[PDB]
Design a protein around this ligand. Structure first.
Ligand SMILES: CC(=O)NCCCCN
Ligand SMILES: [K+]
Ligand SMILES: [K+]
Ligand code: NA
Ligand SMILES: [Zn+2]
Length: 638
C-alpha cells in the first residue's frame, strides 16, 4: 500500500517574469514559487516529502490538450526579443510571455505528469506540484490569465490514456473560473469538473456567461460540469464548507472517482488582491482532508494562482500538512453561509438535480489585511493507541501501539466507590483504566492523537469516558453512537452534541441528531448522504474538543465506518476515542486503520431510499435554525 507524499518543485520555473509595465499581470511573480517552497522548508514539510524531479512535457503530451498551431506559435517565443514578446502577448487576454516561459510551461506540465505517475504507480499516496506558469485558464489554442498550457487538463487526459481511468474528479478551488478545463471536458462524462469562483454576476474576469451555475456540461457530458459562482466578495470558511458539504462532496462520493486532481489556487484565501475572500489558510487543510477518502487517497494537488505572498505560503503549508496526514486545525466561528452564497448553492443544486442522486429530491413536489498566524501542526509520536480484549494481539500499522498506571488505578477506584458502588466485574474495571489511560495520553500528550478501546458494558464505559473528558476539561464533546437505546449522555447544557444512528427513531432536543435509516441495500447511500449533508455540517459548527465514537455490539456498518472515522477526524484536531462493544476483528482493524490515517477503500456504487431522504430533510428543517451550516437554501424572510 502506497505511503508518503510527493513534492515536485524546481527553481527553474521561477526564471521568467514580466518585462514591461502591466498592472493586470504584475501580480504573477517568480517569488510565488520561492516563498511557497521556503515556507514548506521553514515548517519542515518539504523535508518530509518525497522529492520527485520535474521533466519537460513532450510535444505529443502537449498535443493532448492543445493545437499544433498554438504549440508552434508558443515554440517561437524563446527566439523573440522584448518588443516581439509584448506584441505576441497582446494577442491574448491577461498573459505575458518571456524568453524562458515556453521552457517553464513544459516543466510545469511535465511536473504535473510526474505527480500523476508517482501517485498512479503507487510510489506515493498523494502529492503536490508547485509550478509556474499556472494552467487552468489556457485553452486549446490560447494562452489566457497567466496560463500557457493547461497543466491539470494534461493530467486528466494523461491519466485516462496511460492508466485507462474512467472517472477523474477535478476540484478547482482557485478563485477564478478555470474555463480552459471546462471547455476541455465539457462533453466528457469521464472527467467531473467542479469550480467555485468570484463571478459577481459576470462582472468579474473572465466575464463569461458560461461560468454560471447553468453550465452543466454538454451532450454525453451533461451533469459533469459544476460551476458555483460567488456573486459577492468576502466569502468565509462557512461559505466554503457549505459549498463542500452541500454541493461538491455529495457529487464527488456518488461519482466515485479513480483519481482526484486539485487545481489549487490560493487566491481564494484572505488577503489576496484578486479574490478578496475572507477564508483563512486553515480552511485548505480541511478542503484537502474532506477529499482524501476519495480514490483511496490518490490526490494530485497542482498549484494554480495565489498572489498574497503571506497567505500563499500559509495555505500551501496547510495543504501539505493534510497530504502528510497531520492533524487538522480546529475551525472556530462557523455558521450559516451568507445569503448570496446560499443563493448560488440552491441554484446549482436545483439545476444539477436532473443529474445527481443527492439532489434528485429537489426535482418534484412530493420530495422537496491581517489575520492571525496559523498554529503549529505536527503528527503524534504514536498516532493511534489500541486496547483489544485481553490476550488478543493484532498486526498494527507502524504508527499504532497497544494500550495502566497507579495514578489511573486510584482514579478508577475513586470513580467506582462514588458512582458504581456495586461494580466488581474486573473486566469492566479494566476498561475504565484503559479509557482513562488512553484519554490522558490523547488530551495531555502531543504524543498520542486518538485511540480505540474494546469494552463490554456500554453504560459505565460511556459515562466514564464522557465525564472524564468533560472535567479535563474538553469544552465540548461530540458523541457519535451507532446503536439503539438511550445512553448516560445529557445534551441539555450545550457541552455535548449527540449524533445517533439507530433503527427505531424521536426527540425535540436541538443538541441531538437522530438518524433512523431503513434496513436494506440502500443504507450505504443513505448513510453517506446523512454524513456529508447533516453530520459534518453540525459537527463542524459545534467544533468539539473531543469526538467519542460508540458502536453497540448488536450492530451494514463495515461499508461506511471507515469513511466516517476518517472524515470526523476533521474535528477536534483528530482527537477521537472510539468504544467498540464486543470483539469484532474486522471492525476493530478497520477502525484502527482509519484512525491511523491509512487509505480508505472506495465505496464503489447508488441511490438512497426516498423515505430516508425525507427523514434526513426533516432533520435539516428541525436543526438548521440553530445550526446554520446545515442550510442549503436561502431562508424565507418574514
Ligand atoms: C492563475 C490565475 O489566478 N490567473 C488570474 C488572471 C487574472 C486576470 N485579471
Ligand atoms: K475555480
Ligand atoms: K466533463
Ligand atoms: Na494584455
Ligand atoms: Zn486564480
Amino acid at each position: 500500500a502506497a505511503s508518503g507524499s510527493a513534492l515536485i518543485f524546481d527553481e527553474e520555473m521561477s526564471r521568467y517574469k514580466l518585462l514591461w509595465t502591466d498592472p493586470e499581470c504584475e501580480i504573477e511573480v517568480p517569488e510565488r514559487l520561492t516563498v511557497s517552497y521556503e515556507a514548506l522548508r521553514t515548517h519542515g514539510l518539504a523535508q518530509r516529502c518525497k522529492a520527485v524531479p520535474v521533466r519537460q512535457a513532450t510535444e505529443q503530451e502537449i498535443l493532448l490538450a492543445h493545437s499544433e498551431e498554438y504549440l508552434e506559435a508558443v515554440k517561437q517565443t524563446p527566439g523573440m526579443n522584448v518588443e516581439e514578446l509584448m506584441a505576441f502577448s497582446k494577442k491574448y487576454n491577461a498573459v505575458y510571455f518571456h524568453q524562458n516561459i515556453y521552457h517553464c510551461a513544459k516543466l510545469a506540465a511535465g511536473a504535473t505528469l510526474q505527480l500523476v505517475d508517482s501517485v498512479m504507480k503507487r510510489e506515493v499516496r498523494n502529492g503536490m506540484a508547485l509550478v509556474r506558469p499556472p494552467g487552468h485558464h489556457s485553452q486549446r489554442s490560447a494562452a489566457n490569465g497567466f496560463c500557457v498550457f493547461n497543466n491539470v487538463a494534461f493530467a486528466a487526459l494523461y491519466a485516462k490514456k496511460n492508466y485507462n481511468l474512467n472517472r477523474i474528479l477535478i476540484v478547482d478551488w482557485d478563485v477564478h473560473h478555470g474555463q480552459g478545463i471546462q471547455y476541455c471536458f465539457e462533453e466528457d462524462p469521464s472527467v467531473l469538473y467542479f469550480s467555485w469562483h468570484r463571478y459577481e454576476h459576470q462582472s468579474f474576469w473572465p466575464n463569461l456567461p458560461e461560468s454560471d451555475y447553468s453550465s452543466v456540461g454538454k451532450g454525453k457530458g451533461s451533469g459533469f460540469n459544476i460551476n458555483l459562482p460567488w456573486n459577492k466578495v468576502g466569502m468565509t470558511n462557512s461559505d466554503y464548507l457549505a459549498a463542500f458539504f452541500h454541493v461538491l462532496l455529495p457529487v464527488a462520493y456518488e461519482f466515485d472517482p479513480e483519481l482526484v486532481i486539485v487545481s489549487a489556487g490560493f487566491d481564494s484565501a484572505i488577503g489576496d488582491p484578486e479574490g478578496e475572500m475572507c477564508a483563512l489558510p486553515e480552511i485548505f487543510a480541511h478542503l484537502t482532508h474532506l477529499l482524501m477518502p476519495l480514490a483511496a487517497g490518490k490526490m494530485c494537488v497542482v498549484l494554480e494562482g495565489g498572489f498574497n505572498l503571506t497567505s500563499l505560503g500559509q495555505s500551501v503549508c496547510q495543504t501539505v500538512h493534510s497530504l502528510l496526514g497531520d492533524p487538522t486545525p480546529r475551525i472556530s466561528g462557523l455558521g450559516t453561509a451568507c445569503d448570496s452564497a446560499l443563493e448560488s448553492i440552491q441554484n446549482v443544486r436545483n439545476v444539477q438535480s436532473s443529474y445527481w442522486s443527492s439532489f434528485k429530491h429537489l426535482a418534484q413536489s412530493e420530495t422537496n489585511i491581517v489575520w492571525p498566524e496559523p498554529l503549529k501542526r505536527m503528527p503524534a509520536s504514536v498516532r493511534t493507541v489500541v486496547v483489544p480484549p485481553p490476550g488478543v494481539e493484532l498486526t498494527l500499522p507502524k504508527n499504532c501501539q497497544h494500550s495502566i498506571s497507579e495514578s489511573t488505578a486510584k482514579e478508577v477506584q475513586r470513580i467506582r466507590d462514588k458512582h458504581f458502588h456495586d461494580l466488581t466485574d474486573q473486566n469492566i474495571l479494566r476498561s475504565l483504566g484503559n479509557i482513562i489511560s488512553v484519554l490522558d495520553r490523547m488530551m495531555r500528550s502531543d504524543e498520542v492523537c486518538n485511540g480505540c478501546v474494546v469494552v463490554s458494558d456500554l453504560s459505565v464505559s460511556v459515562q466514564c469516558a464522557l465525564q472524564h473528558a468533560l472535567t479535563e476539561p474538553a469544552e465540548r464533546v461530540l458523541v457519535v453512537y451507532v446503536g439503539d437505546g438511550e445512553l448516560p449522555v445529557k445534551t441539555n447544557d450545550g457541552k455535548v452534541f449527540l449524533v445517533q444512528i439507530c433503527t427505531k427513531e424521536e426527540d425535540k432536543c436541538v443538541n441531538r441528531l437522530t438518524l433512523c435509516l431503513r434496513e436494506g441495500e440502500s443504507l450505504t447511500a443513505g448513510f453517506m448522504q446523512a454524513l456529508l449533508g447533516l453530520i459534518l455540517p453540525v459537527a463542524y459548527e459545534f467544533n468539539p474538543a473531543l469526538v467519542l465514537g460508540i458502536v453497540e455490539e448488536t450492530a451494514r456498518l463495515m461499508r461506511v465506518w471507515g469513511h466516517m472515522t476518517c472524515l470526523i477526524q476533521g474535528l477536534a484536531r483528530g482527537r477521537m476515542l472510539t468504544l467498540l462493544q464486543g470483539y469484532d476483528k474486522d471492525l476493530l482493524e478497520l477502525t484502527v486503520s482509519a484512525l491511523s490515517g491509512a487509505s480508505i477503500s472506495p465505496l464503489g456504487p447508488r441511490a438512497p431510499k426516498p423515505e430516508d431522504v425525507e427523514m434526513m430533510e426533516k432533520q435539516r428543517q428541525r436543526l438548521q435554525e440553530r445550526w446554520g451550516l446545515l442550510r442549503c437554501t436561502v431562508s424565507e424572510s418574514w
